[PDB]
Each structure stands twice: as structure tokens, then as C-alpha cells.
Design a protein around this ligand. Sequence first.
Ligand code: PHN
Ligand code: CU
Lengths: 100, 100
Amino acid sequence: PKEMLRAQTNVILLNVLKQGDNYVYGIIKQVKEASNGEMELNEATLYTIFKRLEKDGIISSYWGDGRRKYYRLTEIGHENMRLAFESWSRVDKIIENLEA
Amino acid sequence: PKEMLRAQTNVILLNVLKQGDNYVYGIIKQVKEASNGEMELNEATLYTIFKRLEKDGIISSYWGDGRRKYYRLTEIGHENMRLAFESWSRVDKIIENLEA
Ligand SMILES: c1cnc2c(c1)ccc1cccnc12
Ligand SMILES: [Cu+2]
């Protein structure tokens, strides 16, 4: 379901940036490693997602002295990531009680 | 973020139905209990979500002999729930490796 793989890739990328500013190929490398090789993200996919995140002010970009484009989680981005993690944490516990 | 509370309420409702066919007020009661009272879903919200799920063939409805409308997870619904749980389970582990 396209809308769901989009949400998953979004959460992964934001967690990569949570650990530190990074550039596209460094991100793709980290995600391939952490996924045991089963997630090879495409460059153009990152650009598509990063354009929406930059527009929404969740991330921003800057140049790093050949010159790579780096991305950073903004202050809003960090705060939104925290709200998401906490709200979905509640969802996780709700599902736990339903099953018991 | 409206799109995110929609996804959360969807996952909760599908997990309620995973445990057994149910009707709107029985669902609202279970979700209020499992959430320690902090999630009181509105009737009309369930109807909005169930209309989209029925249309997509994820759930179906039937009458239960005063007569309540019951909802059931379909066969497609169960299988989609399993794929989601497994894919998001991978996402969970990917994020775990990034943090280590
Ligand atoms: C099922 C399970 N987890 C999720 C979703 C659906 C959708 C979004 C999301 C965002 C962050 C963390 N988990 C989820
Ligand atoms: Cu999740």
C-alpha cells in the first residue's frame, strides 16, 4: 500500500537525521546497513521526500565544503518527532491491553 | 497532525476487530478502557472510518438480532493487518539499529 511505505520511509529518514545531520548517500548507506541489506532506498525517493519535509519546515538543508548537500532536523522537526513517538507509544499500549 | 491521528485510530479499530466482531458502542467502550480513559472515540468518527474500510473491502458489516450493526475484519483485512504489522516490525528494528 503506497501510502504506508511512504509513511515508513518517512519515519526511517527522520530517525536517521535525528542521529545527526547527513547527506543522501550517507543516509542510503545507513538505512541499508540497519535494515540488513533489505532496504536500498533510491536517491530520487529521498529527494521527493526531502522536498516535502523542507517545504513543511521539518528539515532544512545546507552545503558541506566536491560539496555535499546536508540535511538537518529542524527544531519543529525534533518536536514533531517527539509527539509522534509519544502518541504512537500510547497506541502501542492500547493495542497491548486489547490483546490481554 | 490530522493525517496521523487518522492512521492511529485506524490501527486501533482494526485491532479491536481483530479480537472479534463488534459494534460501534462496544468498540468505543473497549478503546476507552484499553486507553485508560484518555481515548473517547466519537460515534460519527467510527462511521467515517468504517465507510472507507467497508468500501475498500477491509471490513464488512452485518446485523445482529433492537438490532446492532456488527463489523468484521474480512479475509483481506486480516492479511493486510499481518503485512502491516510485519513491515512496521522491520521499521521498528531498523530504528533500533540506527540508535545503537
Ligand atoms: C502501523 C504501525 N505503526 C505506525 C503506523 C501504522 C503508521 C504510522 C506510524 C508512524 C510512526 C510509528 N509507527 C507508525
Ligand atoms: Cu508504529
